[PDB]
Design an enzyme around this catalytic site. Structure first.
Site, PDB file in Angstrom:
ATOM      1  N   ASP A   1       0.778  -1.260   0.000  1.00 15.23           N
ATOM      2  CA  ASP A   1       0.000   0.000   0.000  1.00 15.23           C
ATOM      3  C   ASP A   1       0.803   1.301   0.000  1.00 15.23           C
ATOM      4  OD1 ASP A   1      -2.135   1.738   0.071  1.00 15.23           O
ATOM      5  OD2 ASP A   1      -2.467   1.456   2.220  1.00 15.23           O
TER       6      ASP A   1
ATOM      7  N   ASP B   1      -1.895   5.463  -5.353  1.00 19.47           N
ATOM      8  CA  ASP B   1      -2.297   4.585  -4.233  1.00 19.47           C
ATOM      9  C   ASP B   1      -2.593   3.130  -4.670  1.00 19.47           C
ATOM     10  OD1 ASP B   1      -3.419   3.402  -2.042  1.00 19.47           O
ATOM     11  OD2 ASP B   1      -4.960   4.960  -1.778  1.00 19.47           O
TER      12      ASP B   1
HETATM   13  C1  LIG Z   1      -9.087  -4.125  -1.972  1.00 21.18           C
HETATM   14  C2  LIG Z   1      -9.215  -2.789  -1.388  1.00 21.18           C
HETATM   15  N1  LIG Z   1     -10.418  -2.088  -1.836  1.00 21.18           N
HETATM   16  C3  LIG Z   1     -10.497  -0.769  -1.544  1.00 21.18           C
HETATM   17  C4  LIG Z   1      -9.594  -0.210  -0.606  1.00 21.18           C
HETATM   18  C5  LIG Z   1      -9.691   1.127  -0.288  1.00 21.18           C
HETATM   19  C6  LIG Z   1      -8.780   1.730   0.719  1.00 21.18           C
HETATM   20  O1  LIG Z   1      -9.256   2.516   1.554  1.00 21.18           O
HETATM   21  N2  LIG Z   1      -7.513   1.312   0.753  1.00 21.18           N
HETATM   22  C7  LIG Z   1      -6.605   1.643   1.820  1.00 21.18           C
HETATM   23  C8  LIG Z   1      -5.881   0.350   2.219  1.00 21.18           C
HETATM   24  C9  LIG Z   1      -6.764  -0.868   2.289  1.00 21.18           C
HETATM   25  C10 LIG Z   1      -6.415  -2.040   1.584  1.00 21.18           C
HETATM   26  C11 LIG Z   1      -7.198  -3.174   1.662  1.00 21.18           C
HETATM   27  C12 LIG Z   1      -8.351  -3.145   2.455  1.00 21.18           C
HETATM   28  C13 LIG Z   1      -8.682  -1.979   3.186  1.00 21.18           C
HETATM   29  C14 LIG Z   1      -7.911  -0.852   3.098  1.00 21.18           C
HETATM   30  C15 LIG Z   1      -5.682   2.759   1.370  1.00 21.18           C
HETATM   31  O2  LIG Z   1      -4.609   3.002   2.301  1.00 21.18           O
HETATM   32  C16 LIG Z   1      -6.443   4.086   1.211  1.00 21.18           C
HETATM   33  N3  LIG Z   1      -5.459   5.143   0.887  1.00 21.18           N
HETATM   34  C17 LIG Z   1      -5.660   6.582   1.168  1.00 21.18           C
HETATM   35  C18 LIG Z   1      -6.144   6.832   2.594  1.00 21.18           C
HETATM   36  C19 LIG Z   1      -7.465   7.243   2.822  1.00 21.18           C
HETATM   37  C20 LIG Z   1      -7.908   7.475   4.127  1.00 21.18           C
HETATM   38  C21 LIG Z   1      -7.065   7.248   5.194  1.00 21.18           C
HETATM   39  C22 LIG Z   1      -5.775   6.813   4.971  1.00 21.18           C
HETATM   40  O3  LIG Z   1      -4.942   6.595   6.031  1.00 21.18           O
HETATM   41  C23 LIG Z   1      -3.590   6.333   5.758  1.00 21.18           C
HETATM   42  C24 LIG Z   1      -5.300   6.616   3.676  1.00 21.18           C
HETATM   43  C25 LIG Z   1     -10.650   1.875  -0.926  1.00 21.18           C
HETATM   44  C26 LIG Z   1     -11.531   1.336  -1.847  1.00 21.18           C
HETATM   45  C27 LIG Z   1     -11.475  -0.013  -2.148  1.00 21.18           C
HETATM   46  C28 LIG Z   1     -12.418  -0.724  -3.124  1.00 21.18           C
HETATM   47  C29 LIG Z   1     -13.846  -0.104  -3.132  1.00 21.18           C
HETATM   48  C30 LIG Z   1     -13.930   1.010  -4.204  1.00 21.18           C
HETATM   49  S1  LIG Z   1     -12.686   2.142  -4.025  1.00 21.18           S
HETATM   50  O4  LIG Z   1     -11.516   1.618  -4.666  1.00 21.18           O
HETATM   51  O5  LIG Z   1     -13.156   3.430  -4.516  1.00 21.18           O
HETATM   52  N4  LIG Z   1     -12.500   2.175  -2.479  1.00 21.18           N
HETATM   53  C31 LIG Z   1     -13.370   3.035  -1.697  1.00 21.18           C
END
Ligand SMILES: CCNc1cc(C(=O)N[C@@H](Cc2ccccc2)[C@H](O)CNCc2cccc(OC)c2)cc2c1CCCS(=O)(=O)N2C
Length: 374
Positions: free
Chosen positions: A32, A217
């Site tokens: 990530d 990301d």
């Molecule tokens: C297979 C993962 N699916 C998604 C993960 C993440 C996510 O938050 N990712 C996190 C990490 C994560 C990975 C796996 C499961 C859960 C979370 C990222 O770190 C988000 N990055 C920016 C961010 C956003 C908010 C707080 C933050 O704190 C460091 C960082 C977001 C999303 C999806 C799939 C649903 C549709 S999407 O792509 O638009 N969406 C909302």
């Protein structure tokens, strides 16, 4: 040795094998770029095949401090500590790193994903509980002789790819590498200077593309866009694809679209071009995204007379996110040492017999506006 060290399932992230503790406990850890905490399941959970058992590690040290991390999707809590960490199909090093031991979570772990933790590869500035918690990659650079750079090649039910630590593997891309500056070391923040849908400019003040930041990301699936860009993009893709009419829920990610197997009409969908700020004033380059990237296949044997897809472009209230569906088919270089991101067409590039993904430049522009939002 490092090539093909990533696996995954579609929509569920890409993971590398790691070990934590002495003696070493093997875990699969999602890569990530969108966060900065290294964290692993450390208590039983219904979706976890295995978890970090701190009582079995002699090198473990409790920092006596809890942590909470909420993401866009999912959240977890746990306990800070440190321990020895290695990457079997990575560089041959062992480093002592900060580890969050996840003891409670909500909608974080994914049923059948094959991963049990997460590796936040971004900067300290967004680490929880604060920037004094040194991220893993910083620890690695400081403790070993690894050059301050990594590259990712994400490929599109099961998927794979490569994370190259400490350099660049020329065998993973063709043509030129184009660099966009990292605007601010927190997220891998970059600047988008123009967006075209099928060659047609969205004609918006470029700051809108970056309201209130744009990031690269790997931990987020979709291309996520600020509402105004999202609405304008959907209108254009709808218009370009108007030979067929889809349910409103399709465009909102609430519903699949399905075609008889092998008959997906790729040609009715446009190409999306994202122009990134260049390293030289008013210059840019573009990366071009085919529908094979932004219509994400959803594997399900029950629906397998058909090919079915989700629209992998969605709305954000926290800025642009160039997620995994955008990164896939590019070789992306996170050149921390020179504070820049490089893009090139990868060995696993997306293409049919009419169109291909590209990274092309330079483009020049009369407009002297800075596109950065803040
Ligand atoms: C297979 C993962 N699916 C998604 C993960 C993440 C996510 O938050 N990712 C996190 C990490 C994560 C990975 C796996 C499961 C859960 C979370 C990222 O770190 C988000 N990055 C920016 C961010 C956003 C908010 C707080 C933050 O704190 C460091 C960082 C977001 C999303 C999806 C799939 C649903 C549709 S999407 O792509 O638009 N969406 C909302």
């Amino acid at each position: 040795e490092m090539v093909d060290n990533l696996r995954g399932k579609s929509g569920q992230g890409y993971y590398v094998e790691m070990t934590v503790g002495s003696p070493p406990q093997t875990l699969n850890i999602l890569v990530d770029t969108g966060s900065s905490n290294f964290a692993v399941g450390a208590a039983p959970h219904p979706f976890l095949h295995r978890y970090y058992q701190r009582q079995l590690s002699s090198t473990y040290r409790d920092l006596r401090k809890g942590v909470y991390v909420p993401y866009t999707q999912g959240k977890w809590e746990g306990e800070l500590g440190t321990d020895l960490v290695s990457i079997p199909h990575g560089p041959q090093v062992t480093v002592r790193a900060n580890i969050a031991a996840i003891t409670e979570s909500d909608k974080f772990f994914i049923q059948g994903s094959n991963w049990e933790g997460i590796l936040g590869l971004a900067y300290a500035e967004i680490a929880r509980p604060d920037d004094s918690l040194e991220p893993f990659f910083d620890s690695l650079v400081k403790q070993t002789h690894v050059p301050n750079l990594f590259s990712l090649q994400l490929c599109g039910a099961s998927v794979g790819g490569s994370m190259i630590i400490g350099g660049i593997d020329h065998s993973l891309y063709t043509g030129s590498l184009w660099y966009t500056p990292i605007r601010r070391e927190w997220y891998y923040e970059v600047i988008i200077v123009r967006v075209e849908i099928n060659g047609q400019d969205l004609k918006m003040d470029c700051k809108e593309y970056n309201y209130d930041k744009s990031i690269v990301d790997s931990g987020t699936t979709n291309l996520r866009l600020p509402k105004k860009v999202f609405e304008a993009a959907v209108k254009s893709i709808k218009a370009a694809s108007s030979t067929e009419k889809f349910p409103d829920g399709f465009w909102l990610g609430e519903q699949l679209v399905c075609w008889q197997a092998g008959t997906t009409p790729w040609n009715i969908f446009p190409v999306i071009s994202l122009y990134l700020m260049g390293e030289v004033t008013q210059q840019s380059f573009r990366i071009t995204i085919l529908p094979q990237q932004y219509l994400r296949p959803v594997e399900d044997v029950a629906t397998s007379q058909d090919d079915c897809y989700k629209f992998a472009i969605s709305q954000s209230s926290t800025g642009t996110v160039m997620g995994a569906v955008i990164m896939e088919g590019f070789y992306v270089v996170f050149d921390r040492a020179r504070k820049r991101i490089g893009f090139a067409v990868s060995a696993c590039h997306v293409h049919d017999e009419f169109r291909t993904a590209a990274v092309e430049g330079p483009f020049v522009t009369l407009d002297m506006e800075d596109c950065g939002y803040n």
